[PDB]
Structure 1
Amino acid sequence: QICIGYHANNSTEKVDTILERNVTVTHAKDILEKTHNGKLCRLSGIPPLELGDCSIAGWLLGNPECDRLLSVPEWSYIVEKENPTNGLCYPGSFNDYEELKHLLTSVTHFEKIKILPRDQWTQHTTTGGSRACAVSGNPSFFRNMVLTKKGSNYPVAKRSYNNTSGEQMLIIWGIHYPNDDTEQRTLYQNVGTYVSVGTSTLNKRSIPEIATRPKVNGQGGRMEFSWTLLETWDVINFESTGNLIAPEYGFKISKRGSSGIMKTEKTLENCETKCQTPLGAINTTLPFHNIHPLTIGECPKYVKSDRLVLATGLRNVPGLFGAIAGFIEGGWQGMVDGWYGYHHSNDQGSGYAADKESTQKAFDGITNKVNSVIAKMNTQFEAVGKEFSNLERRLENLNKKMEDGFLDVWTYNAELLVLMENERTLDFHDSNVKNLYDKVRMQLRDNVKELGNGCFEFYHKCDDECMNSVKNGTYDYPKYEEESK
């Protein structure tokens, strides 16, 4: 007697198929990554720029609360709190702010350089400050910026700088807006004042916009800041009859590509990732994850799913081809060295001897299937999270519509891929068994009796060397013509 059978174990693993729910399977693999390392990590060897709770404007201008900040020269992304507490301490706005943040998102190379030393505003006053930028407890000011009247005169302030630094240079400036016609005079004397900034491509003329304004940080005046990239060997010319907030410093900058600002309160921790999320770093081969939408790096596709389990083993029983959980009604706890095999009854003994030839063919296939699903995913470097001013709501909605669109596609396709491939994995196993049963049946023929539950009853004594011929497809029909029927 020799039976064909398949593996069963104590697994409680469940998968879903197109056709069935909660099907207990022999072995499985989750292709959805859900674990991170809880650390904020550096990205391919380069750390993030950590802004504490300063805004980028606060940092670049030199808000006094950003004094103890720690400026690395390289950085691969930026960490900023959702709502930083130290930004424009003197109230105001920053032209094209979001475009600026996007520029500084990742950097070569970034170095602050003194370009217009303050002591050389010889004909103007330099120490103007404000209680809004106070340093316990005297009036101070943005440390990287500087001009008010000298006596009762404010000559035309006019300086220029040639970018001899060998790199592209960020440069920021501002114009002040007083509270009312008077206040202006006590600050700049003249009235029809202007601020003029120009380069090879830049040219701009601002005039003070006076208005009555509530007090922010105790002030009613405002400062509006602008910025430019000054190309190498180009010069920038400042000219002002008043209200100019001048830079003392510029910033050498070089860039490879772009990255993103990650909103979080976590802090750099000394590890590596190819993929960062505001919750922690992801290290995975898997094509999908559900940790968090706002990742930076080379990441798996984010998916709304919270389970993507591929079946690798077979239906686990205590079928398209009618064998597994079919005409062979049960699995074997006993066979523990393969997925399909034989169970013999002999004068010598019995009887579990797994079929290595076919079990490998399946291990290979199911291996290759899992790898196809994984190895076909194209994962380039992306940032995801973006920034939009309060008058770019539509644009922000477009971006959201886009991110939601791709989320739905990947979720749907991953969910369906898993369901379909699972149905086909179970059917694969069923077919592997059915064919084993057929390979024996087509080998014995008259020499055995098909019992019904997966077994052949031999019409002759079949010792061990006999089985070792049927198990390996060498059984010879002619050698047996004992007819007990």
Structure 2
Amino acid sequence: DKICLGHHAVANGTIVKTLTNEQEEVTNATETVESTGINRLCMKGRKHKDLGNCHPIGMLIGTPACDLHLTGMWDTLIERENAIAYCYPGATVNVEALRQKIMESGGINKISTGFTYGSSINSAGTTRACMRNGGNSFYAELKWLVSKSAGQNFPQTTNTYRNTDTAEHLIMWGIHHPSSTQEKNTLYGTQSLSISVGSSTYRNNFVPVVGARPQVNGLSSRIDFHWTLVQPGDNITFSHNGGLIAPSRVSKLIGRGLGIQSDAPIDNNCESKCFWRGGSINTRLPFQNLSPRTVGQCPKYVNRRSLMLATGMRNVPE
């Protein structure tokens, strides 16, 4: 005549790790590391700009791919794999620090610089290397200044952008590196070329580096870009001999937002706080094993395929 105590068990328990033991069986566990993510960018509750074939640098200089992106407002800014920054050969000096100022930002304004050029100047220079809407063109925010009369010396010019706003303004400019010495002489003249650039907080001199012989060889016509912030109340001046690709507008980055670099397609139906190269991550869990490169509010990447946490007791079957 008898009364017994006992506990439950399950047909098949789950194996989990303890301090004293791997392979310790349990009545039930659950996963603590997230191994599956949504493969689309989730943008509910966010005003976002999906730059598409545009690259953030193009935004500041107005490359044709970037025409619809010269201004904007955004919580988030998405950037895609093969994106286009330039239509004319050349790079941006110090370009990574810049992409990040554009990707940390929350919007862009454009302010005219009011730059005006003498008669001796063609300020309406264009190139086939920049086909906008079917025709020879150029960067939207710069102007390719050359001698109005071919061959005759480009005049000693001065231009001054004044920042009168209460925020710093990012100004950009190009320096044209001719392809052959014959060419330099056509656009600008035989005179020695020199571009000084100076604000209170910057100072520099650039000289076009002329190329030689075939178009095909490493040294050909390219345009390299430079940049500086202009602080509120501060004037910035250019002194050119020609070679200057001068800005018609300057930029002003507004607020703060989240830059995503992703190849995933945008889903506005879905909400999320954490993103990566190949999608999002919406999880309860504190650890994820999808990728070590994420941005936003994120579960920490760990190099473990699986970490089971017992939710039940030891599983002793009969």
Q: Which residue of 1 aligns with 2:243?
A: 243
Q: State whether residues 128 and 137 of structure 2, in contact with CA within 8 Å, keep that contact through their aligned partners in structure 1.
A: yes
Q: TM-score, normalised by structure 1?
A: 0.59
Aligned CA distance change for structure 1 residues 262 and 136 (closer, same or farther; 3 Å)? closer
Distance in 1 separating the partners of 2:230 and 2:178: 29
Q: Which amino acid aligns with 2:191?
A: V
Q: Which residue of 2 aligns with 1:89?
A: 87
Q: Which residue of 2 aligns with 1:139?
A: 136
Higher relative contact order (Cα pairs below 8 Å, separated by 6+ residues): 2
**Is 1:72 aligned with 2:72?**
yes
Q: Which residue of 2 aligns with 1:163?
A: 163
Pick from 117, 122, 128: which aligns with 1:121? 117
Larger radius of gyration: 1
Q: Which residue of 2 aligns with 1:29?
A: 30
SS at match of 1:148: strand
Deviations 1:110-158 (A, max 9, x none): 21222235xx324321221111112364321111110000223522221
Structure 1 residue 188: Cα displacement = 1.0
Deviations 1:251-275 (A, max 9, x none): 112455x855524253353543221
Q: State whether residues 167 and 232 of structure 1, in contact with CA within 8 Å, keep that contact through their aligned partners in structure 2.
A: yes
Q: State whether residues 35 and 288 of structure 2, in contact with CA within 8 Å, keep that contact through their aligned partners in structure 1.
A: yes
Q: Which residue of 2 aligns with 1:8?
A: 9
Q: Which amino acid aligns with 2:90?
A: G
Distance in 1 separating the partners of 2:305 and 2:207: 57
Q: Which residue of 1 aligns with 2:205?
A: 205
Distance in 1 separating the partners of 2:74 and 2:42: 15
**Bigger mean CA offset, 8-17 vs 27-36:** 8-17
Q: Which amino acid aligns with 1:31?
A: T
Aligned CA distance change for structure 1 residues 69 and 201 (closer, same or farther; 3 Å)? closer
Distance in 2 separating the partners of 1:72 and 1:8: 61
Deviations 1:434-480 (A, max 9, x none): xxxxxxxxxxxxxxxxxxxxxxxxxxxxxxxxxxxxxxxxxxxxxxx
Distance in 2 separating the partners of 1:39 and 1:70: 26
Distance in 2 separating the partners of 1:248 and 1:214: 32
Structure 1 residue 29: Cα displacement = 2.1
**Bigger mean CA offset, 51-60 vs 158-167:** 51-60
Aligned CA distance change for structure 1 residues 259 and 63 (closer, same or farther; 3 Å)? same
Alignment of 1:346-425 (within 5 A): none
Structure 1 residue 288: Cα displacement = 0.7
Distance in 1 separating the partners of 2:229 and 2:281: 35
Structure with greater helix percent: 1
Distance in 1 separating the partners of 2:219 and 2:54: 20
Structure 1 residue 205: Cα displacement = 0.8
Distance in 2 separating the partners of 1:272 and 1:235: 44
**Is 1:225 aligned with 2:225?**
yes
**Is 1:40 aligned with 2:46?**
no
Q: State whether residues 153 and 191 of structure 2, in contact with CA within 8 Å, keep that contact through their aligned partners in structure 1.
A: no
Q: Which amino acid aligns with 1:143?
A: A
Deviations 1:281-315 (A, max 9, x none): 22233221112221101211101111110112112
Aligned CA distance change for structure 1 residues 8 and 211 (closer, same or farther; 3 Å)? same
Q: State whether residues 79 and 264 of structure 1, in contact with CA within 8 Å, keep that contact through their aligned partners in structure 2.
A: no
Alignment of 1:86-485 (within 5 A): 86-116=84-114, 120-123=116-119, 124-135=121-132, 137-146=134-143, 147-151=145-149, 152-212=152-212, 215=215, 220-256=220-256, 260-267=259-266, 269-318=268-317, 330=318
Q: State whether residues 108 and 254 of structure 1, in contact with CA within 8 Å, keep that contact through their aligned partners in structure 2.
A: yes
Structure 1 residue 57: Cα displacement = 2.4
Q: State whether residues 289 and 300 of structure 1, in contact with CA within 8 Å, keep that contact through their aligned partners in structure 2.
A: yes
Unaligned runs of 5+ in 2: none
SS at match of 1:276: strand
Structure 1 residue 67: Cα displacement = 2.1
**What is the total number of aligned residue pairs between the two structures?**
312
Runs of 4+ in 1 over 6 A off after TM superposition: none
Distance in 1 separating the partners of 2:269 and 2:104: 19
Structure 1 residue 163: Cα displacement = 0.8
Q: State whether residues 275 and 282 of structure 1, in contact with CA within 8 Å, keep that contact through their aligned partners in structure 2.
A: yes
Q: State whether residues 168 and 254 of structure 1, in contact with CA within 8 Å, keep that contact through their aligned partners in structure 2.
A: no
Structure with greater strand percent: 2
Q: State whether residues 91 and 219 of structure 1, in contact with CA within 8 Å, keep that contact through their aligned partners in structure 2.
A: no
Distance in 2 separating the partners of 1:179 and 1:148: 15
Aligned CA distance change for structure 1 residues 285 and 245 (closer, same or farther; 3 Å)? same
Distance in 2 separating the partners of 1:66 and 1:99: 20
Q: State whether residues 25 and 313 of structure 1, in contact with CA within 8 Å, keep that contact through their aligned partners in structure 2.
A: yes
State the identity as a percent: 38
Distance in 2 separating the partners of 1:29 and 1:13: 9
Q: Which residue of 2 aligns with 1:374?
A: none
SS at match of 2:200: coil
Aligned CA distance change for structure 1 residues 214 and 18 (closer, same or farther; 3 Å)? farther
Q: State whether residues 212 and 219 of structure 2, in contact with CA within 8 Å, keep that contact through their aligned partners in structure 1.
A: no
Q: State whether residues 181 and 210 of structure 2, in contact with CA within 8 Å, keep that contact through their aligned partners in structure 1.
A: yes
Q: State whether residues 197 and 239 of structure 2, in contact with CA within 8 Å, keep that contact through their aligned partners in structure 1.
A: yes
Q: State whether residues 277 and 294 of structure 1, in contact with CA within 8 Å, keep that contact through their aligned partners in structure 2.
A: yes
Structure 1 residue 213: Cα displacement = 7.4
Distance in 2 separating the partners of 1:106 and 1:305: 31
Deviations 1:51-81 (A, max 9, x none): 21222222321111222448432333x4222
Distance in 1 separating the partners of 2:19 and 2:266: 44
Distance in 2 separating the partners of 1:70 and 1:127: 20
Distance in 1 separating the partners of 2:106 and 2:58: 21
SS at match of 1:233: coil
